[PDB]
Amino acid sequence: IYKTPPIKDFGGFNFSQILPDPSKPSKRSFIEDLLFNKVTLQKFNGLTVLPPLLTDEMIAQYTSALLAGTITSGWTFGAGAALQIPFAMQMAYRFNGIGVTQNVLYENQKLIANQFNSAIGKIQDSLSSTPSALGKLQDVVNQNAQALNTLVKQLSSNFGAISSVLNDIL
Amino acid sequence: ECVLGQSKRVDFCGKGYHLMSFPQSAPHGVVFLHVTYVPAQEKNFTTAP
Amino acid sequence: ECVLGQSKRVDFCGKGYHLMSFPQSAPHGVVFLHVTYVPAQEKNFTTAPAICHDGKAHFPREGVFVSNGTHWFVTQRNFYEPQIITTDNTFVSGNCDVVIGIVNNTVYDPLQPELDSFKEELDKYFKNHTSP
Amino acid sequence: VVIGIVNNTVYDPLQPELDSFKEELDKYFKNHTSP
Amino acid sequence: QSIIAYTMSLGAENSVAYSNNSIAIPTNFTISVTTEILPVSMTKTSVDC
Ligand SMILES: *[C@@H]1O[C@H](CO)[C@@H](O[C@@H]2O[C@H](CO)[C@@H](O[C@H]3O[C@H](CO)[C@@H](O)[C@H](O)[C@@H]3O)[C@H](O)[C@H]2NC(C)=O)[C@H](O)[C@H]1NC(C)=O
Ligand SMILES: *[C@@H]1O[C@H](CO)[C@@H](O[C@@H]2O[C@H](CO)[C@@H](O[C@H]3O[C@H](CO)[C@@H](O)[C@H](O)[C@@H]3O)[C@H](O)[C@H]2NC(C)=O)[C@H](O)[C@H]1NC(C)=O
Ligand SMILES: *[C@@H]1O[C@H](CO)[C@@H](O[C@@H]2O[C@H](CO)[C@@H](O[C@H]3O[C@H](CO)[C@@H](O)[C@H](O)[C@@H]3O)[C@H](O)[C@H]2NC(C)=O)[C@H](O)[C@H]1NC(C)=O
Ligand SMILES: *[C@@H]1O[C@H](CO[C@@H]2O[C@@H](C)[C@@H](O)[C@@H](O)[C@@H]2O)[C@@H](O[C@@H]2O[C@H](CO)[C@@H](O)[C@H](O)[C@H]2NC(C)=O)[C@H](O)[C@H]1NC(C)=O
Ligand SMILES: *[C@@H]1O[C@H](CO[C@@H]2O[C@@H](C)[C@@H](O)[C@@H](O)[C@@H]2O)[C@@H](O[C@@H]2O[C@H](CO)[C@@H](O)[C@H](O)[C@H]2NC(C)=O)[C@H](O)[C@H]1NC(C)=O
Ligand SMILES: *[C@@H]1O[C@H](CO)[C@@H](O[C@@H]2O[C@H](CO)[C@@H](O)[C@H](O)[C@H]2NC(C)=O)[C@H](O)[C@H]1NC(C)=O
Numbered sequence: 001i002y003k004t005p006p007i008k009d010f011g012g013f014n015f016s017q018i019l020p021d022p023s024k025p026s027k028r029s030f031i032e033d034l035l036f037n038k039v040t041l042q043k044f045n046g047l048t049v050l051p052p053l054l055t056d057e058m059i060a061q062y063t064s065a066l067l068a069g070t071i072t073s074g075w076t077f078g079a080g081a082a083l084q085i086p087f088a089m090q091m092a093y094r095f096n097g098i099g100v101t102q103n104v105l106y107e108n109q110k111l112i113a114n115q116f117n118s119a120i121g122k123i124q125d126s127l128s129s130t131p132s133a134l135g136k137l138q139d140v141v142n143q144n145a146q147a148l149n150t151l152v153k154q155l156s157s158n159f160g161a162i163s164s165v166l167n168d169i170l
Numbered sequence: 171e172c173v174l175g176q177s178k179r180v181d182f183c184g185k186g187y188h189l190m191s192f193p194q195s196a197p198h199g200v201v202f203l204h205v206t207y208v209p210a211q212e213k214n215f216t217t218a219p
Numbered sequence: 220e221c222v223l224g225q226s227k228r229v230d231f232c233g234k235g236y237h238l239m240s241f242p243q244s245a246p247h248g249v250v251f252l253h254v255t256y257v258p259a260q261e262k263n264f265t266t267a268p269a270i271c272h273d274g275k276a277h278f279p280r281e282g283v284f285v286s287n288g289t290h291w292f293v294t295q296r297n298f299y300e301p302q303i304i305t306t307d308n309t310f311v312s313g314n315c316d317v318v319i320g321i322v323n324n325t326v327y328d329p330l331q332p333e334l335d336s337f338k339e340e341l342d343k344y345f346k347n348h349t350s351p
Numbered sequence: 352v353v354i355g356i357v358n359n360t361v362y363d364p365l366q367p368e369l370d371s372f373k374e375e376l377d378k379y380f381k382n383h384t385s386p
Numbered sequence: 387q388s389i390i391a392y393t394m395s396l397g398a399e400n401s402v403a404y405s406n407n408s409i410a411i412p413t414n415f416t417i418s419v420t421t422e423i424l425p426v427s428m429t430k431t432s433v434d435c
């Protein structure tokens with residue numbers, strides 16, 4: 001589990017929305033606080049819900065390591081021993097994977113810097129404005145609740161008996 | 171495949187030329203932020219084989 | 220894919236850089252033997268984004284510039300193999316007034332040593348021609 | 352054999368690397384005439 | 387020897403030292419083999435009603 005250095009001199013980029021915010025009681029960043037607010041979510045008849053093994057705070061600690069490693073080390077930490085490379089050369093390698101020569105980045109370092117930062121800001125606005133952005137997750141939670149709720153409703157059905165109350169017929 | 175590294179499969183990790191991705195936690199899910207290169211305005215020319 | 224060829228999808232055929240695999244049978248199943256190549260012990264160095272020599276920004280054709288604190292060279296990305304800075308290993312692109320964080324080094328080209336030998340060879344021939 | 356081919360001059364970077372030397376050598380030969 | 391309960395450890399903590407002019411280039415390597423197991427079939431069975 002890697003952790004980011006305190007310094008944030010990442011060549012004009014800021015990863016503020018994705019880097020964890022220490023201020024919150026849980027070490028969550030700006031973006032995934034929006035998501036946790038968007039979603040909408042023991043019983044009498046045996047129906048119990050068991051807690052997950054990984055507590056919700058534990059997962060957010062993993063994603064920091066997956067994110068801290070990829071912003072300072074490249075692809076090495078996934079396939080070997082972690083090695084450090086400055087972020088300015090991290091982008092240069094990616095362009096070689098596109099087929100464009102590496103000189104273009106160092107020639108226009110400001111333009112890519114501004115476009116990346118501006119693009120990240122839009123995601124926060126786009127997610128937080130339209131309510132249908134999270135339809136896929138919202139389908140899972142609603143589907144589970146509906147089926148389970150119908151099961152309880154079934155106890156009131158007569159099934160062709162005289163009364164749906166078990167003690168009443170007895 | 172395209173968080174620990176770069177993907178050459180087309181459309182598999184976001185439309186356009188791919189650079190990297192960033193994971194973010196979610197309730198009962200995961201959300202990806204694909205940073206994809208996309209060519210801008212073009213210009214016509216004359217070519218020879 | 221993993222067996223009949225070489226794989227590029229990271230962490231699909233073995234954990235690490237993949238070479239091949241050798242399948243083996245099993246009762247109601249199959250078992251693979253992935254052969255993975257992984258780098259051993261490392262060593263920290265001094266790096267640069269480019270080199271400017273005569274006003275122009277230079278860039279390695281493949282790899283990265285590297286220094287141990289005294290001299291600059293170019294090596295491959297995944298194995299320390301020191302090499303003298305050659306233009307055949309380093310193309311040129313425009314001037315060096317925009318590269319943020321640029322550093323300084325002289326640029327060598329294997330063209331000069333060929334010319335250096337002939338230039339010195341030509342010097343002695345003209346000296347001989349003065350005798351008559 | 353190739354279809355669609357057109358004609359165009361081709362630059363050779365190593366040629367001026369030797370043309371300049373041959374130019375400078377030819378100047379030396381002219382210089383060598385004076386003594 | 388007895389039975390104990392505790393909070394699980396997310397792994398061995400390890401920090402990395404980022405800088406803007408530092409690089410690390412390996413000087414050696416090892417070739418390790420890792421196994422992988424996958425089911426491919428089950429025992430077929432037929433039943434007369
Ligand atoms: C960083 O890498 C440099 C490039 O290899 C290296 O410079 C080289 O250092 C070696 C010694 O380690 C020299 O080797 C020669 O040393 C003396 C010098 O007279 C000779 O008598 C020996 O026979 C041997 O040939 C190289 O000459 C030298 N190269 C250059 C271009 O200077 C640095 O020493 C390295 N620095 C560290 C801290 O490792
Ligand atoms: C890498 O080496 C380059 C050449 O040695 C060097 O460029 C030179 O920089 C000096 C000082 O930075 C300039 O000297 C002039 O500097 C200012 C103008 O910027 C004047 O006020 C001074 O009086 C002095 O005349 C040289 O003109 C300049 N040479 C060229 C060809 O540009 C780089 O600065 C070096 N880079 C690094 C990172 O060290
Ligand atoms: C690129 O340069 C080529 C050489 O300079 C040139 O080829 C020349 O083309 C002319 C035009 O046909 C030929 O002239 C002769 O053509 C036929 C044989 O092809 C003869 O029967 C005619 O009487 C006439 O004399 C040249 O012989 C020919 N030269 C060579 C060396 O092939 C190309 O045409 C140029 N490319 C383009 C696109 O024009
Ligand atoms: C590059 O040019 C093409 C068309 O080629 C041109 O055709 C003539 C007009 C003449 O000027 C030729 O010398 C040129 O090579 C453009 O395609 C046209 O696009 C417009 C809309 O932008 C459309 O109305 C036309 O129908 C298109 N042409 C055809 C033949 O369908 C192309 O857009 C030009 N490149 C850019 C970036 O605009
Ligand atoms: C390579 O170096 C880094 C740090 O650079 C060091 O900076 C100076 C102190 C000087 O001694 C340089 O020559 C060094 O290279 C190492 O990161 C440090 O590692 C030690 C344990 O080895 C750790 O205690 C420190 O906290 C680390 N630094 C920071 C800022 O956290 C790195 O380990 C070196 N590479 C290898 C393979 O050991
Ligand atoms: C990194 O970039 C981000 C976004 O481009 C900056 O975030 C805002 O910065 C201003 C200036 O102080 C604050 O008033 C805003 O509150 C910040 N946004 C949010 C959502 O808090 C950030 O300041 C930049 N950091 C640096 C060091 O330049």
Ligand SMILES: *[C@@H]1O[C@H](CO)[C@@H](O[C@@H]2O[C@H](CO)[C@@H](O)[C@H](O)[C@H]2NC(C)=O)[C@H](O)[C@H]1NC(C)=O
Nearest residue numbers: 257258259260261299412413414415416417418
């Ligand atoms: C790279 O590592 C291998 C082992 O992983 C080294 O091989 C060993 O070298 C030592 C020398 O001290 C021998 O005692 C061992 O017997 C060797 N192992 C085997 C399996 O032969 C190798 O020397 C290293 N090479 C470099 C350049 O670091």
Ligand SMILES: *[C@@H]1O[C@H](CO)[C@@H](O)[C@H](O)[C@H]1NC(C)=O
Nearest residue numbers: 007009319320321405406407
């Ligand atoms: C690296 O960062 C330090 C301070 O964060 C700065 O002084 C130095 O100039 C930076 N390196 C380069 C090459 O800009």
Ligand SMILES: *[C@@H]1O[C@H](CO)[C@@H](O)[C@H](O)[C@H]1NC(C)=O
Nearest residue numbers: 343344346347348349350351
């Ligand atoms: C000059 O060249 C001739 C052969 O071309 C040789 O015999 C003679 O020794 C040379 N002169 C000197 C001073 O070496």
Ligand SMILES: *[C@@H]1O[C@H](CO)[C@@H](O)[C@H](O)[C@H]1NC(C)=O
Nearest residue numbers: 217218219353354355356357
């Ligand atoms: C391209 O096509 C046109 C007609 O479609 C034809 O006249 C021309 O010769 C072709 N180009 C070449 C190089 O043959």
Ligand SMILES: *[C@@H]1O[C@H](CO)[C@@H](O)[C@H](O)[C@H]1NC(C)=O
Nearest residue numbers: 349378379381382383385386
């Ligand atoms: C011409 O040749 C002489 C040697 O005889 C040399 O000293 C001089 O420098 C040469 N001229 C030039 C312009 O180099």
